[PDB]
């Protein structure tokens, strides 16, 4: 059929419309927004806390800070990098020495069907540990509150402030998971996939969006701080988009060929 | 010392960066012409790029075979990234750790291409990994290209006299290379 | 109390689960997203807008066509929605991350040449035979339409939906030996008579949509390797 | 049938090879309500920031290779003046109003004769950081008139090269590898776009509305568009012909709604 | 309604379950217009 | 038995669940409350009464006015509810017990001097500029208010709710680098002519109380450093 | 336009009103009274200088 797609409108046409054709039954609705981001999917490896954590400072962190690594899940699809959002994501092709090796997470099945910009939705956060046996619980702070960092001492014990609070600290059983559905709570009207804007915390960072996140999660051992057990432990952070909307249409990954 | 190096080794750690991109007819000149103007057997000569990815392109080796075929490969270089000169030298490090092993006294000599300008955080990662080839006992010459930060490279190479400039420096790493050779067995 | 007797499946996370889970945070009112033009409703939305496709010439959207007759087809590339001219179109990248398809991939053109160039194009599609059609004798018996260049500059051929199943599968995996839905195959007809003192070689821009009635099945996990 | 001649207030611009407005997301993008994250009132159009603001873009040569592209942020080009584009009573109205809230309406000039051939794809892309360099900085305009036309290599395409905070010196510095605001060059169709053909017109037309993570974004910080000129096909023609094309671009912001008034901006 | 399949019976309310915005006073649409 | 299948998320103690729990002791009939007044419905009954602020002058709830002429603010304090002048305000140490607010602060004024004292304030209130506004050329182009002193004795500028999102942070944790919401700064116009036998320097005394639209979200855990 | 019917071109008309200074810059008559003069199947524009003045009757 003749066309102009210098336009930018294409009509898009069957067989009938060059041909002797006619159209195909209509197969399924699996392409739905709310229904092909409702799935859950690895978000975040994070080791468990067993003491009262000094969260990361800000960057750029410098030499000497005796602060707490690879700790803490902020709850996004970007790029993170060091429980922070990032705009690059960085892994380590050759980890030998040097420093601290950064905690980076990024999530996979999203940006390759992430063809929008702007995205909206619900989270089911679920926490499987990665441990056999493990007694753990999961902490939650919204976007744009930050972690409180000391401790109490109970009846001769250093039991955290992460114990207690207004935000949700779930319990796990012994050998259980946890999980729970947060709203959306940052103060963004929605997240940005793709941002270029400039966010004036620092020495303003384009395209780096200051609150698409819906939190940060972090898991603990019930036990106070005399009882710290010595072999790190592991956690798996799986999330769901709950009630997912998506507006302005964009671009997809580049696929390389070689 | 007295006695002669058993093994004469290069290091070409060739910055290809995107901030090179613009210079890297440049530096492949530098090394199209030290790798053919000494085809002696006693040098064995590596070429390790980074921008992002420290890589080795070519492992130290002395068969002439590989070392035409490695600069049939700087040729299709292209560039762009960021500047990662902390693991240019890392990809380094693991070579002459390695031919620690053999029990030799070799004098492995470090040629660092660069543009200078490094950030001001990666500036610490790349006089670390500097200092940990300055624990391997090898020497370290900054190669400048056209415009470049001598005191972004006078703490990478030895002194601020081992920074050379690309025009002026080529010769004079004849005058280096050339010298240890006759020192060599 | 009531008495239930929970299944074998219990304490069983499972990520695909069609259900709810227990709210922590509740009463939370968002801010409303009402000032937000152009929603996606569905991802079918996206697979019929026309991407560009890409050519082993080194990755070129479009065939250059060289002066020279020869009786092959300029370009020719499987309809199978794995191969590598799909892989950064939105049919192709949005169908890879799926398991089956059907409807019709809808192959848009557009003559980038100058505008006194006529000539006639004789688009094609082959079902899979054994041996990929080649001679312009051989095009002309599979689903042809000959595309002229004139006032207009774009032809949007139609690869029809001819399958034995009704939905096919979205990725070559095994085996499909080069035969999975056979080959579009654009042969030159006419060659391009051009005026003097005008550019040899003209550019025909591909791009690749998808027809009203194609539709996606089955979600699967996606390629993870446009990170790396 | 083609020739549309789109007045507004006093700056009347013409195109004779007219392909049509692509209306963008919506029907009318000129409609627009006021932000609702805004309790003083807002400073809405008026007759001397309802026009066409045009400046020029960098020549299009046969050395342009392609999907060798060229950006122009929006407002960003208003601010820093990319192409000569001086905003005027909008720039001096944009500088004291801490918010703004547009809609953008833009068409890209470059008249092809009928013995050239090339296509560019003009396309309004959302939330992308091409204007800025890989370290931070955003380009003026002595850095754009060197490379005149940013080429696609594999940074670009990839989003490897995008604005970072640097993560100190406590942190090993990754291998960046991925950054969500690439270019994937095959695709930029999906985008408010027309084809600026040399064979099918001279102008294109595309109209957008307001998009952003919030009701209204900042004034000194937002790219909420970018008007994006990808050369798909290279520019071509025998020896004689007009040699460099030039190319332009004409802005005009559709229904802005300014807030939070202040003194001039100073950084 | 996305991938939900509990149809009968939704125990917590609306406003626990999802989060609805608060207010301020199938059939594909195209999402770009010639016009 | 009823068959059931438990949740994931069984055995679970939440702190905040919105449910009950079993009663254990119950049928208590408790004594009626019927005889107290002034019950609190909700705690922004209490944000609106205004409260003492605190300067750093040895924290004083009023400001000085000098006699001698200067062209800087007298006083000057960043709208950000964790600021030092709000922690011993029912404003501040509420919503410092939350995470976000939304509306207007109230600071009212009283003029403690003596009766037979004239003169005239600029209040003021900058959005978050890249410079603190000092010059009262400067916080004439900003959100101002004159304030004359006269028969009445005090002035409620209502600093207003300016903001790209409906929710402000209540705490300056990251960044905020001085300038979160910007500042409220008590220029004075014409200087105070006090009659032969006055005391100098009169006494502004500032309250901050809430606006009638001022309200809280988000419960957070508290600073329990006022016990230390 | 007496050229040939293939010469494509445009053209800025324009009007300042009185200023210290004539405008010389295209960034200066973009600012003024303008309209652009496609040439094409067309071949006549009229730009319309307008009445612009402190007095109902100029001299
Ligand atoms: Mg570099």
């Not at chain 2, 190096?5 to 199209?32: A, M």
């Not at chain 3, 499972?14 to 509740?26: K, Q």
Request: aromatic letters at 12%.
């Amino acid at each position: 059929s003749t066309d102009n797609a210098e336009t930018g409108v294409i009509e898009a046409g069957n067989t009938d419309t060059d041909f002797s054709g006619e159209l195909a039954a209509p197969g399924s609705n699996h392409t739905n927004v709310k229904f092909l981001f409702d799935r859950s999917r690895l978000l975040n490896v994070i080791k468990v806390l067993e003491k009262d954590a000094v969260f990361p400072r800000p960057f750029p962190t410098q030499e000497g800070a005796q602060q707490d690594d690879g700790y803490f899940c902020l709850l996004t699809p970007r790029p993170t990098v060091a429980s922070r959002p990032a705009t690059r994501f960085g892994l380590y092709a050759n980890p030998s020495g040097s420093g601290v090796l950064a905690n980076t997470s990024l999530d996979f099945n999203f940006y390759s069907l992430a063809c929008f910009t702007y995205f909206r939705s619900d989270l089911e956060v679920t926490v499987v540990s990665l441990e056999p046996d493990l007694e753990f619980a999961v902490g939650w702070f919204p976007s744009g509150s930050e972690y409180q960092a000391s401790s109490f001492v109970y009846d001769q014990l250093h039991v955290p402030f992460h114990f207690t609070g207004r935000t949700p600290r779930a319990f796990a059983s012994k050998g259980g998971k946890v999980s729970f559905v947060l709203p959306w709570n940052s103060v963004s009207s929605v997240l940005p996939v793709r941002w270029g804007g400039a966010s004036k915390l620092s020495s303003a960072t384009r395209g780096l969006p200051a609150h698409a996140d819906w939190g940060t999660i972090y898991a603990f051992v019930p036990r106070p701080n005399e009882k710290k057990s010595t072999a790190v432990k592991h956690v798996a952070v799986y999330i769901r988009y709950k009630n997912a909307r998506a507006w302005c249409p964009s671009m997809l990954p580049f696929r390389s060929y070689k | 010392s007295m006695a002669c190096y058993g093994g004469f080794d290069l290091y070409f750690i060739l910055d290809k960066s995107g901030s090179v991109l613009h210079h890297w007819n440049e530096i492949y000149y530098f090394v199209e012409q030290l790798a053919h103007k000494f085809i002696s057997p006693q040098l064995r000569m590596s070429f390790i790029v980074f921008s992002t990815r420290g890589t080795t392109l070519m492992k130290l080796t002395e068969d002439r075979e590989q070392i035409r075929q490695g600069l049939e490969e700087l040729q299709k270089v292209l560039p762009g990234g960021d500047t990662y000169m902390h693991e240019g030298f890392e990809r380094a490090s693991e070579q002459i750790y390695y031919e620690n092993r053999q029990g030799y006294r070799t004098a492995s000599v470090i040629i660092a291409l660069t543009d200078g300008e490094l950030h001001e955080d990666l500036f610490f990662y790349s006089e670390r990994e500097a200092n940990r080839s300055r624990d391997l006992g090898a020497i370290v010459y900054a190669v400048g290209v056209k415009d470049f930060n001598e005191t972004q490279l006078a703490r990478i190479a030895d002194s601020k006299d081992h920074v050379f400039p690309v025009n002026d420096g080529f010769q004079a790493l004849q005058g280096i290379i050339h010298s240890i050779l006759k020192k060599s067995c | 109390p009531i008495p239930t007797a929970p299944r074998e499946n219990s304490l069983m996370f499972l990520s695909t689960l069609p259900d709810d889970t227990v709210p922590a945070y509740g009463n939370v009112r968002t801010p409303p997203v009402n000032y937000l033009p152009g929603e996606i409703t569905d991802l079918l939305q996206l697979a019929r807008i026309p991407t560009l496709m890409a050519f082993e010439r080194t990755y070129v959207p479009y065939v250059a066509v060289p002066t020279q007759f020869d009786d092959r087809p300029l370009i020719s590339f499987p309809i199978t929605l794995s191969d590598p001219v799909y892989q950064n179109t939105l049919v192709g990248a949005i169908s890879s991350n799926f398991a089956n398809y059907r409807g019709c991939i809808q192959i848009t053109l557009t003559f980038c040449g100058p505008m006194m160039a006529r000539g006639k194009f004789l688009l094609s599609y082959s079902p899979p035979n054994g041996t990929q059609p080649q001679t312009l004798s051989e095009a002309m018996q599979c689903t042809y339409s000959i595309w002229d260049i004139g006032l207009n500059s774009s032809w949007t051929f139609v690869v029809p939906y001819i399958s034995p199943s009704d939905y096919r599968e979205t990725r070559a995996i095994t085996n499909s030996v080069y035969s999975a839905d056979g080959w579009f195959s654009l042969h030159k007809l006419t060659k391009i008579t051009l005026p003097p003192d005008c550019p040899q070689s003209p550019c025909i821009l591909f791009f690749a949509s998808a027809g009203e009635d194609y539709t996606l099945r089955l979600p699967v996990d996606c390629n993870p390797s446009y990170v790396f | 049938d083609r020739v549309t001649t789109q007045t507004a207030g006093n700056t009347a611009i013409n195109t004779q090879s007219s392909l049509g407005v692509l209306c963008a997301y919506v029907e009318d993008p000129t409609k627009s309500d006021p932000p609702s994250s805004s309790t003083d009132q807002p400073t809405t159009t008026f007759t001397a920031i309802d026009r066409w603001y045009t400046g020029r873009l960098n020549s299009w040569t046969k050395a342009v290779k392609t999907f060798s592209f060229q950006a122009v942020p929006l407002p960003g080009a208003f601010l820093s003046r990319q192409g000569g584009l001086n905003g005027g009573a909008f720039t001096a109205t944009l500088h004291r109003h801490f918010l703004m809230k547009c809609g953008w309406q833009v068409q890209v000039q470059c008249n092809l004769t009928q013995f050239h051939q090339g296509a560019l794809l003009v396309a309004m892309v959302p939330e992308t950081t091409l204007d800025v360099k890989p370290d931070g900085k955003a380009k003026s305009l002595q850095e754009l008139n060197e490379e005149q036309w940013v080429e696609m290599s594999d940074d670009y395409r990839t989003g490897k090269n995008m604005p970072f905070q640097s993560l100190g010196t406590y942190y090993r510095p990754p291998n960046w590898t991925w950054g969500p605001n690439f270019i994937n060059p095959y695709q930029v169709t999906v985008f408010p776009h027309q084809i600026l053909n040399a064979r099918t017109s001279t102008s294109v037309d595309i109209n957008v509305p307001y998009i952003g993570e919030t009701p209204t974004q900042s004034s000194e910080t937002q790219n909420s568009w970018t008007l994006l000129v990808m050369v798909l096909v290279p520019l071509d023609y025998k020896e004689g012909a007009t040699t460099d094309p030039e190319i332009t671009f004409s802005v005009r912001p559709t229904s802005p709604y300014f807030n939070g008034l202040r003194n001039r901006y100073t950084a | 309604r996305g991938n939900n399949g509990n149809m009968t019976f939704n125990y917590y309310a609306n406003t626990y379950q999802n989060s609805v915005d608060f207010s301020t006073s199938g059939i594909l649409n195209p999402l770009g217009y010639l016009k």
